[PDB]
Amino acid sequence: GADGVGSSSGNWHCDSTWLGDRVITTSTRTWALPTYNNHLYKQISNGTSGGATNDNTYFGYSTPWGYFDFNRFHCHFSPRDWQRLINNNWGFRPKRLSFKLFNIQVKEVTQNEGTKTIANNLTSTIQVFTDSEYQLPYVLGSAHQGCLPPFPADVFMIPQYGYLTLNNGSQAVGRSSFYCLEYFPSQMLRTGNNFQFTYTFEDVPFHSSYAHSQSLDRLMNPLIDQYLYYLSRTQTTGGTANTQTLGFSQGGPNTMANQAKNWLPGPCYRQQRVSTTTGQNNNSNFAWTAGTKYHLNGRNSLANPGIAMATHKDDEERFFPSNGILIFGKQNAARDNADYSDVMLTSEEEIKTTNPVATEEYGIVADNLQQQNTAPQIGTVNSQGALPGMVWQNRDVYLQGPIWAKIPHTDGNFHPSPLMGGFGLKHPPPQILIKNTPVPADPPTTFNQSKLNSFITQYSTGQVSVEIEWELQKENSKRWNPEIQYTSNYYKSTSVDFAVNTEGVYSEPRPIGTRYLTRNL
Amino acid sequence: GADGVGSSSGNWHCDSTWLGDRVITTSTRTWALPTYNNHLYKQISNGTSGGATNDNTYFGYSTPWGYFDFNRFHCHFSPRDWQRLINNNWGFRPKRLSFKLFNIQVKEVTQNEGTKTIANNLTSTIQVFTDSEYQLPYVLGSAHQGCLPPFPADVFMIPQYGYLTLNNGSQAVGRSSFYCLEYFPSQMLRTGNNFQFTYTFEDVPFHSSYAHSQSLDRLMNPLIDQYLYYLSRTQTTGGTANTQTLGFSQGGPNTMANQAKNWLPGPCYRQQRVSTTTGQNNNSNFAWTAGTKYHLNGRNSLANPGIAMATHKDDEERFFPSNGILIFGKQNAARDNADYSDVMLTSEEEIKTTNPVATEEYGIVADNLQQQNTAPQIGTVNSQGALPGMVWQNRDVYLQGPIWAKIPHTDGNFHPSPLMGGFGLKHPPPQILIKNTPVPADPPTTFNQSKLNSFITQYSTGQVSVEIEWELQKENSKRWNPEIQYTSNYYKSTSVDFAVNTEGVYSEPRPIGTRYLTRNL
Amino acid sequence: GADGVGSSSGNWHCDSTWLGDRVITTSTRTWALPTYNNHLYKQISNGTSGGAT
Amino acid sequence: WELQKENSKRWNPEIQYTSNYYKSTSVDFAVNTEGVYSEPRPIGTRYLTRNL
Amino acid sequence: IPQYGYLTLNNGSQAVGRSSFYCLEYFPSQMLRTGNNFQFTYTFEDVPFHSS
């Protein structure tokens, strides 16, 4: 109706509504936006001139702007809600979202000798816009820090926006592009204004959350023989001198490894195996050398995690592929050289049925061409691309994991599902940029052409709301016996899981996968 | 209105019209159609009975007919028009075409002793038809010579039509098929008639003409750390005796080779590397032996060019893959054993971002399974198929290159984009066949059953017009700094580029790629 | 609609639009205006009395 | 602004204005390490050609 | 924002009779506080295209 400094722009909303196949999750947080780079664009670079190896060189710019990132699940779901979701449902996909930004304060702080003081600046503004035409480097989806906090009572700091471009060493080539963010139409807000927009997701396949109750090779009937034959005997038996001969048999219950099958496991690109028990591992540093890397433009890049694979086979739980998994840190984990007990290892073991084990070969093929003179030889397939009749599962999404990623714009792609897990999108949710409008200090009395480098130390805070509507796929199954469910531990504990401790620090005990309920292949 | 020998059938058209997102290019040429094979079908063959190796054997027929081929770009675009196109636009695709054939003369030449004389034959006809049901071997798209000339003032000769069929050695098998082209309904034209038809392309994705301003591995934010971890340490350090241990770290600006990534480069099938500087290459003839070949039906076939890959990495310009590029000849180049200075080498270097370098491996994988007893081992991937989450770019189209190719009719295919570049089409533009109607010489006075082998030496000429409507994808980009453009050299020269020389010979100095403007991944 | 110290007067615009034979370029900048001459008009002059030619 | 479209039958390619393809320490028409914006060269308006 | 000043007829450092003096406060102007804005439009007269 009427906006001003005395009225409030918007109301707090955190809620989740469950109706039929829809669930609508809304959230609200409090943010604080500092001034970055003293309002300057800057060329940032790193090159082999220093100690940096040729692989880590980069060239790019760092903008004064800042951006909102809600791309992680736990922003939108309380652990309880996540439990309603993964226990009762096969799959889900987002439909549409809404975004609101309101109740803006802008404050200016000054330093006089040793005293610090902070006072409202009522006339200052902030600038906000969204890129809806995707005309900027899209920097979301790389799993950077700085999303909304999982716990609504936390106040968070908005990250700085920057991007990278083509480089040769530390230098730049001709195609290198430079973007000036002030060059887009944006909306300017004072303390009595608010900002909002809506967005509608394109059709996306449901994320399958479930494990297969069968395995790809066991689809057969155990009771009945096949009518097809296979080559079971190359040589006579029982004789003192055995000669080569041919004989055939029908696949049956006794030998099921020989039966014909319609389908093949998903592709395999091998990882190195590492044991959680230290003593069993080799004594050396093989992490970077023995890692599984892909080579692009004379630059070796570790492949992290890589394509979706089973972490380990039965009773192998102490083993995990080198880089082939997602690893989340526990609360108050060190940044570098953190101990094993400070991190949380995800496990893809649920997909063992459809996909091959990450640390083992795909299969065996014939190397040579046999003769009565020469013996047959076999060979091992470490890397296997796609073949007609392969089926595979994507990687599981976690409560801490990213929701979506932008499918790059290219001539062609193969199954465009982000490797880190999520929903691939041609047109992801537009990224939102925000900046404090610079306010100069006292200019000189005599004209000078040079730009003004002196400004008023300033920052702004406010509220942000995001609301996403999700579509659910109900679970319809005739299974007689009980399912596996996700459940909290019944035994006593010093402190409640997913709750604040004595000091008020919120923490998450373990990652939570999405696959519990079962289906038939 | 009224057609006859005195009226003209059609008017000359060469023009290009630029309206909005459409551009309509029309062209006209003068052709001459000789009599081939003395009006005879003939079995042609080659086999290992001679010096020919088993790989080059073939079996097929050569028809008296002849056909029109406009499949190359430079037929439809003047170099200037090609410059308007590639500088201002991201992509384009054809919409519909028109074809006209008119102003037909048919002349008969006789030899009397040493004198030669040529006179109009007013009553003779020619036969023309198009196969719109695709019931013939489709011979276009193999980049054969004989398309329309690039320069409108040239008169060209129509090529002869022939096709190949299944063979075993020089012989033919049972499935070998024989087609009689007189067995189709065709239209017969005298000097007062004209021929035309229209065609409408099926929906086809725009050809992407642009380079990526980013690279596939650099999509990350340089400023912010990831919240994921990786395995950075397998062993203690600083001690006199170091023991195996586990430690983890977060990917960050300093080490970007270790960060998790959502996508992978396109597939890789390696090529042998050759230096343009002769001295650096090995001394031997490895061209055929060390080439990259695919084996089909006991017959080795060189893979030319192969799938799209970057020609070379940074500052490698002197290197090119063996057969993995397109090579165009300069004007008046020799047919066989031409010198390096007589040919023009295309370069795919623009796609380095998305696709791997053609001459280097795809990556590294783990060969063995480590233990405290045994060291880990690594292995190299030379050939890599498709894996989920790969992105790639197609090969660039050139002003001299082919426009389209017919996607073979098969059960299944993978990304059906022709390797030589172009638009893959289920129903390409129908191919057009043309022949002089045979006119017998004086038959004997007494009946004889044998067919008449004596004919009047004869040929025909006329005009041909083709008009194609193209659809454009406008370039909308916020990049601040200037683009790279294609431009002619400012410095003085003996003769103008893309123009006739003193002797009247038209020539093209260099190939012209389509990728200049830039985009973000 | 209603202007005051809490509302913002206008929105940032920098854009260029290409339509047919028209192109429309808009721009926006931030300025700072000092007080000159202590709010005084002043006669300024220079002459050959000094070193000036 | 009002534009006058270029309608010309010239066969061979025009001269265009284009950025340098070769590598460089810093991008032209962009901020440097210190954040100072700079313009490398003046840019004239005459490239396309006409007949007298 | 630069300072506004202007020159007039002179003889040496002195001024002649035709020298004019303008008082800028003598024009109608619009006064704005922090809640106000200012705008106007303008239309160029017909001018020949700049030949590039």
DSSP per-residue codes, A286-349: -TTTSS-EEEETTEEEE-SS-S--BS--TT-TTEEESSSS-EEEPTT--SEEE-GGGEEE---G
HSE, side-chain direction, 13 A CA sphere, residue C35:
4
Contact B357, B269 (CB under 8 A): no
CA distance A217 to A521: 10
Q: What are phi and psi of B385, to 5 degrees?
A: -75, -160
Task: Spell out the residues 6+ positions from residue B180 whose beta carbon is closer than 8 angstroms to its own.
Answer: B41
Which run of H or E residues covers position A85? helix A79-88
For residue E34, give the 3-state DSSP assignment.
coil
Given a contact cutoff of 8 angstroms between Cβ atoms, the answer to whether A163 and A137 are in contact is: yes
Backbone torsions φ then ψ of B402, nearest 5 degrees: -75, 145
Burial A73-87 (b: 16+ CB within 10 A, else e): bbbbbbbeebbebbb
Beta bridge partners of A127: A188, A435
- The CA-CA-CA angle for residues B30, B31, B36, to 5°, reads 175
Q: In angstroms, what is the resolution?
A: 3.1
Numbered residues of chain B with Cβ closer than 8 Å to any chain D Cβ: 78-80, 82-83, 87, 480-488, 490, 496-499
Token duo for residue A213: 């109750």
Which residues lie across from A366 on neighbouring strands? A378
Radius of gyration of chain B (CA): 29
Residue A414 distance to chain B (closest CA, Å): 6
Instruction: Look up tokens 């003293």; give the residue.
Output: A38
3-state secondary structure at position A31: strand
Contact at CB, A123 and E2, closer than 8 angstroms: no
- Find the farthest-apart pair of alpha carbons in chain C and give their distance in angstroms, rounded: 60
Do the two chains C and D touch, given a threshold of 8 Å on CB pairs and at least 3 pairs?
A: yes
Strands (E), chain C: 15-19, 22-26
Classified as helix, coil or strand, D34 is coil
Using CA atoms in the order B415, B418, B422, B425, what is the torsion angle rounded to 10 degrees? -70
Q: Which class for A484: exposed (0-12), middle (13-18), buried (19 or more C-beta within 10 A)?
A: exposed
**Alpha-carbon separation of residue B110 from A110, A498, B42, B205, B457 (angstroms):** 105, 101, 25, 53, 7
Task: Note whether D30 contacts A43, CB cutoff 8 Å.
Answer: yes
Contacts of B514 (CB under 8 A, 6+ apart): B86, B207, B209, B396, B397, B398
Torsion, Cα of A148, A151, A156, A160 (10° steps):
-30
Q: Cβ-count burial of B224 within 10 angstroms (0-12 exposed, 13-18 middle, 19+ buried)?
A: buried
Distance, CA of A282 to CA of A272 (rounded, Å): 12
Choose among A43, A174, A176: nearest Cβ to D33. Answer: A43
Q: How far is CA B115 from the centre of its chain?
A: 44
Residue A417 in marked binding region: yes
Strands B211-212 and B518-519 come out as parallel
CB-CB: which of B219, B257, B370 is closest to A300? B257
- Report the distance separating Cα A250 and Cα A233, nearest Å: 12
| Residues of D whose CB is below 8 A from C22 | 1-3
Q: How far apart are CA B388 and CA B391, in angstroms?
A: 9
Asked if A171 and D33 come within 8 Å (Cβ–Cβ), the reply is no
Distance CA D51, CA E2 (A): 44
Q: Name the residue among B49, B481, C44, B208 with its Cα closest to residue A410.
A: B208
Query: Which tokens is B259 given?
Result: 């960060």
Give the Cα separation of A176 and B484 in Å (integer). 10
Using a CB-CB cut-off of 8 Å, the residues of chain E touching D4 are: 49
| A412 φ, ψ (degrees, to nearest 5) | -150, 160
For chain B, report the end-to-end CA distance as a whole number of angstroms. Answer: 57
Residues B249 and B232: beta-carbon distance below 8 Å: yes
Q: Would you state the structure tokens that stand for residue B514, as one six-digit string?
A: 């389509």
Structure tokens at A514: 């999405």
Nearest CA in chain D to B150: D11
Q: Is B81 helix (H, G, I), strand (E, B) or coil?
A: helix
Sign of CA dihedral A508, A513, A516, A517: positive
